[PDB]
Design an enzyme around this catalytic site. Structure first.
Site, PDB file in Angstrom:
ATOM      1  N   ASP A 110      -4.159  -5.803  -2.134  1.00 37.04           N
ATOM      2  CA  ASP A 110      -2.904  -5.404  -1.499  1.00 37.04           C
ATOM      3  C   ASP A 110      -1.706  -6.230  -1.935  1.00 37.04           C
ATOM      4  OD1 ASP A 110      -4.182  -3.374  -0.167  1.00 37.04           O
ATOM      5  OD2 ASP A 110      -4.157  -4.396   1.800  1.00 37.04           O
TER       6      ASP A 110
ATOM      7  N   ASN B 193      -4.107   1.142  -1.919  1.00 34.42           N
ATOM      8  CA  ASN B 193      -4.206   1.683  -0.560  1.00 34.42           C
ATOM      9  C   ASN B 193      -3.560   0.662   0.362  1.00 34.42           C
ATOM     10  OD1 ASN B 193      -4.820   3.426   1.507  1.00 34.42           O
ATOM     11  ND2 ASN B 193      -7.013   2.940   1.610  1.00 34.42           N
TER      12      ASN B 193
ATOM     13  N   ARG C 198      -2.975   9.109   4.155  1.00 29.06           N
ATOM     14  CA  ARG C 198      -2.495   8.248   5.250  1.00 29.06           C
ATOM     15  C   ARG C 198      -1.055   8.667   5.555  1.00 29.06           C
ATOM     16  NH1 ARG C 198      -3.834   2.143   4.311  1.00 29.06           N
ATOM     17  NH2 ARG C 198      -3.077   2.097   6.490  1.00 29.06           N
TER      18      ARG C 198
ATOM     19  N   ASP D  68      -7.271  -4.293  13.945  1.00 23.02           N
ATOM     20  CA  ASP D  68      -8.082  -4.686  12.794  1.00 23.02           C
ATOM     21  C   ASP D  68      -9.223  -5.602  13.198  1.00 23.02           C
ATOM     22  OD1 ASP D  68      -5.495  -4.935  10.182  1.00 23.02           O
ATOM     23  OD2 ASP D  68      -6.241  -3.214  11.314  1.00 23.02           O
TER      24      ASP D  68
ATOM     25  N   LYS E 207      -6.472   4.818   8.855  1.00 25.28           N
ATOM     26  CA  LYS E 207      -6.344   3.642   8.004  1.00 25.28           C
ATOM     27  C   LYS E 207      -7.151   3.702   6.710  1.00 25.28           C
ATOM     28  CE  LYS E 207      -4.377   0.991  11.626  1.00 25.28           C
ATOM     29  NZ  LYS E 207      -4.542  -0.021  12.694  1.00 25.28           N
ATOM     30  N   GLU E 208      -7.729   2.585   6.244  1.00 27.31           N
ATOM     31  CA  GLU E 208      -8.460   2.610   4.966  1.00 27.31           C
ATOM     32  C   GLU E 208      -9.465   3.751   4.859  1.00 27.31           C
ATOM     33  OE1 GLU E 208      -7.124   0.049   6.399  1.00 27.31           O
ATOM     34  OE2 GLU E 208      -6.892  -1.612   5.002  1.00 27.31           O
TER      35      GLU E 208
ATOM     36  N   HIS F  53     -12.567  -2.577   3.018  1.00 23.34           N
ATOM     37  CA  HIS F  53     -12.910  -4.000   3.097  1.00 23.34           C
ATOM     38  C   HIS F  53     -13.502  -4.394   4.445  1.00 23.34           C
ATOM     39  CE1 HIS F  53      -8.679  -4.970   4.863  1.00 23.34           C
ATOM     40  NE2 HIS F  53      -8.810  -3.659   4.777  1.00 23.34           N
ATOM     41  N   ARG F  54     -12.927  -3.923   5.552  1.00 20.00           N
ATOM     42  CA  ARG F  54     -13.467  -4.324   6.852  1.00 20.00           C
ATOM     43  C   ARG F  54     -14.821  -3.746   7.228  1.00 20.00           C
ATOM     44  NH1 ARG F  54      -9.712  -7.700   8.070  1.00 20.00           N
ATOM     45  NH2 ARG F  54      -7.536  -7.041   7.665  1.00 20.00           N
TER      46      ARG F  54
ATOM     47  N   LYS G 164      -9.743  -6.039  -1.118  1.00 16.48           N
ATOM     48  CA  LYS G 164      -8.462  -5.502  -0.671  1.00 16.48           C
ATOM     49  C   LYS G 164      -7.661  -6.614   0.026  1.00 16.48           C
ATOM     50  CE  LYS G 164      -6.250  -1.506   1.484  1.00 16.48           C
ATOM     51  NZ  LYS G 164      -5.387  -2.074   2.580  1.00 16.48           N
TER      52      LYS G 164
HETATM   53  O1  LIG Z   1       2.233  -4.499   9.708  1.00 13.29           O
HETATM   54  C1  LIG Z   1       1.129  -4.949   9.315  1.00 13.29           C
HETATM   55  O2  LIG Z   1       0.999  -5.973   8.643  1.00 13.29           O
HETATM   56  C2  LIG Z   1      -0.140  -4.212   9.705  1.00 13.29           C
HETATM   57  C3  LIG Z   1      -0.123  -3.396  10.862  1.00 13.29           C
HETATM   58  C4  LIG Z   1      -1.355  -2.613  11.304  1.00 13.29           C
HETATM   59  O3  LIG Z   1      -1.153  -1.172  11.120  1.00 13.29           O
HETATM   60  P1  LIG Z   1      -0.708  -0.036  12.281  1.00 13.29           P
HETATM   61  O4  LIG Z   1       0.618  -0.409  12.825  1.00 13.29           O
HETATM   62  O5  LIG Z   1      -0.629   1.299  11.607  1.00 13.29           O
HETATM   63  O6  LIG Z   1      -1.751  -0.077  13.358  1.00 13.29           O
HETATM   64  C5  LIG Z   1      -2.649  -3.146  10.635  1.00 13.29           C
HETATM   65  O7  LIG Z   1      -3.736  -2.241  10.919  1.00 13.29           O
HETATM   66  C6  LIG Z   1      -2.461  -3.369   9.131  1.00 13.29           C
HETATM   67  O8  LIG Z   1      -3.674  -3.876   8.570  1.00 13.29           O
HETATM   68  C7  LIG Z   1      -1.322  -4.371   8.914  1.00 13.29           C
HETATM   69  O1  LIG Z   2      -6.234  -4.360   6.915  1.00 15.68           O
HETATM   70  C1  LIG Z   2      -6.707  -3.445   7.709  1.00 15.68           C
HETATM   71  O2  LIG Z   2      -7.669  -3.562   8.422  1.00 15.68           O
HETATM   72  C2  LIG Z   2      -6.035  -2.159   7.781  1.00 15.68           C
HETATM   73  N1  LIG Z   2      -4.911  -2.127   6.867  1.00 15.68           N
HETATM   74  C3  LIG Z   2      -4.055  -0.973   6.875  1.00 15.68           C
HETATM   75  P1  LIG Z   2      -2.818  -1.148   5.721  1.00 15.68           P
HETATM   76  O3  LIG Z   2      -3.434  -0.675   4.397  1.00 15.68           O
HETATM   77  O4  LIG Z   2      -2.408  -2.599   5.627  1.00 15.68           O
HETATM   78  O5  LIG Z   2      -1.731  -0.249   6.247  1.00 15.68           O
END
Ligand SMILES: O=C(O)C1=C[C@@H](OP(=O)(O)O)[C@@H](O)[C@H](O)C1
Ligand SMILES: O=C(O)CNCP(=O)(O)O
EC number: 2.5.1.19
Length: 427
Positions: A49, A94, A124, A313, A340-341, A385-386, A411
């Site tokens: 990422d 992603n 997404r 997460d 999400k992912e 990844h999770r 990721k």
């Molecule tokens: O702003 C951020 O850094 C993130 C917000 C979250 O998403 P959502 O707001 O769509 O839940 C999270 O799941 C993602 O891994 C990172």
């Molecule tokens: O990191 C995680 O669990 C989910 N991430 C979603 P993102 O791809 O950062 O919008």
């Protein structure tokens, strides 16, 4: 395909120096790029990422250098909105925060840029953000499916009254908040209704302030932004360790410790996922808080029933930790796991049943009843990844577990398995 088999782990104990926060890293890189001056980021995360964001910055003409381990980055600020034309394509894998934040930021001024990514990224949602940016004046075109990337950005966001839906992702608001200060006109962002993943908004405002900008937050229902501002380099900035990545290690101790200490985050951290430690405490584990560490020591592990909307997460880690808890665990208010992912509610329910659990996959919740004893399974990871990291915890039992495509952890945490191994003890 590739796979990794984890042998049973008798006990976990030790210290992990956390990799940098992905959420802080990508916000810091974008703000550093827009700012005036040279920003030196330390403890920056090296993962897919962040690499996609760095590649996007390179493509947009931003100059920066990285240390040998890619955790130190010296960024030469652009001193204003980034620009490119010719429908330049930025591939964002992603990486949600990169896709959402750049979709908004690149709407400043004129531009002709296309944002795209991996097949899943084209599934997404981003319509709520596009709707908001258009109310502010941006010209945005969906090149494939309406409401999803890829997008062709042609600029024009000037500010004004902008409504944004916060019910599916907080990233849309985050993207607007970082972009609005550089718009020529003042902006009033009004949240339509509910706001999910609220703690991430605090991360955004924290980073913006570090880079010299503040806005008026009116109870998270409306945000008043003054336009014509400029981001300024904070000099040297230390990226917090990733609290989401820390969850696996703290949960491992709650299940099979021992005491596991994670460094790089502490009681003062801006990340909402440090609240994951609170959940382990409620389940029966013992937690220690430090200025630059959080530790977890095995106590007992009881099932819980709670709303996890504030830690979506890290909440996934409780779903597999639930296999070791007494009673039925219910995680609620987590609908966006589906966007999400991968659709995480479907994926988590499916893989949990493979190791023996009885699971109710709710529309926006998951109920998990652990089996008397876990069985072996080959876990599918859905390019997530999770899923790989969460299921690695199955090995804290008497059965091994095979994880498909283990490299998907890259990721956000390329060295995950080596780090889990570091605290895995045979005695
Ligand atoms: O702003 C951020 O850094 C993130 C917000 C979250 O998403 P959502 O707001 O769509 O839940 C999270 O799941 C993602 O891994 C990172
Ligand atoms: O990191 C995680 O669990 C989910 N991430 C979603 P993102 O791809 O950062 O919008």
């Amino acid at each position: 395909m590739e796979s990794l088999t984890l042998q049973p782990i008798a006990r976990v104990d030790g210290t992990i120096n956390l990799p940098g926060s992905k959420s802080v890293s990508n916000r810091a890189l974008l703000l550093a790029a827009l700012a005036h001056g040279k920003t030196v980021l330390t403890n920056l995360l090296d993962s897919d990422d962040v690499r996609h964001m760095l590649n996007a910055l390179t493509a947009l003409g931003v100059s920066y250098t990285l240390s040998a381990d890619r955790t130190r980055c010296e960024i030469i600020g652009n001193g204003g909105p980034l620009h490119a034309e010719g429908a330049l394509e930025l591939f964002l894998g992603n990486a949600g925060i990169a896709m959402r934040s750049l979709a908004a930021a690149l709407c400043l001024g004129s531009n002709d840029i296309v944002l795209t990514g991996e097949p899943r990224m084209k599934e997404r949602p981003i319509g709520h953000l596009v709707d908001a940016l258009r109310l502010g004046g941006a010209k945005i075109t969906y090149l494939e499916q309406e409401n999803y990337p890829p997008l062709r950005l042609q600029g024009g966001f000037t500010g004004g009254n902008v409504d944004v839906d916060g019910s599916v992702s907080s990233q849309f608001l985050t993207a607007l908040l970082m972009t609005a200060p550089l718009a020529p006109e003042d902006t009033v962002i009004r949240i339509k209704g509910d706001l999910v993943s609220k703690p991430y908004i605090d991360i955004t405002l924290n980073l913006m302030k570090t880079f010299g900008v503040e806005i008026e937050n009116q109870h998270y229902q409306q945000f008043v932004v003054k336009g014509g501002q400029s981001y300024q380099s904070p000099g040297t900035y230390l990226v917090e360790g990733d609290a989401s990545s820390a969850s696996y290690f703290l949960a491992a101790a709650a299940i099979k410790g021992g005491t596991v200490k994670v460094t790089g985050i502490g009681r003062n951290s801006m990340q909402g996922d440090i609240r994951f430690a609170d959940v382990l405490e409620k389940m029966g584990a013992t937690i220690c808080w430090g200025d630059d560490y959080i530790s977890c020591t095995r106590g007992e592990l009881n099932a819980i029933d709670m709303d996890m909307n504030h830690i979506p997460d890290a909440a996934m880690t409780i779903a597999t930790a639930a296999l070791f808890a007494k009673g039925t665990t219910t995680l609620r208010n987590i609908y966006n796991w589906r966007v999400k992912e991968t659709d995480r509610l479907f994926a988590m329910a499916t893989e949990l049943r493979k190791v023996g659990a009885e699971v109710e996959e709710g529309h926006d919740y998951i109920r998990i009843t652990p089996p008397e004893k876990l069985n072996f399974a080959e876990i599918a990871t859905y390019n997530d990844h999770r899923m790989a990291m969460c299921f690695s915890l199955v090995a804290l039992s008497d059965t091994p577990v095979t994880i498909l495509d283990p490299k998907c952890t890259a990721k956000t945490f390329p060295d995950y398995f080596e780090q889990l191994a570091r605290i895995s003890q045979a005695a």
